[PDB]
Amino acid sequence: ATLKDYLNKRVVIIKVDGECLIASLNGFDKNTNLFITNVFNRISKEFICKAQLLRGSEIALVGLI
RNA sequence: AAUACAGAGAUCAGCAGUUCCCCUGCAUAAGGAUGAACCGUGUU
């Protein structure tokens, strides 16, 4: 199991608190720490960041859109 | 000895089996020939 096939692609991320993101996945490590670019709030469609680092503890789901 | 009789009394063919001999298989023994690019003491 690996997030390799998702690199540089757009993804949906569901956080553990049920919050939702849309972003380009650029980096990831073994603990699921993500490096993201052009992040948005799925529900809100509100631009969050041009670049952001997201802890794996926070992630519940990553989907390939 | 006399008599009564009954009174002159199977053939064609096939296959395997012993005996040597050649061809071809598998086995058991010994014998040889040659080929195979790789080297074991603090987040679930």
Q: What single letter denotes the amino acid at residue A49?
A: C
How many structural domains is chain A composed of? 1
Instruction: Answer whether A54's CB lies under 8 Å from A28's CB.
Output: no
Can you give the resolution of this entry in Å? 3.8
At A13, phi and psi to the nearest 5?
-125, 130
Instruction: Answer whether A44's CB lies under 8 Å from A52's CB.
Output: no
A32 contact partners, CB below 8 Å, separation of at least 6:
A3, A56, A59
CA of A17 to C1' of B6 (A): 137
- Residues by CB within 7 A of strand B: list them: A 30-33, 55-57
Q: What single letter denotes the amino acid at residue A51?
A: A
* Residue A58 structure tokens: 């926070």
What CATH number has the domain bearing residue A53?
2.30.30.100
Which structural domain, as residue segments, surrounds residue A48? 1-65
CA of A7 to C1' of B21 (A): 84
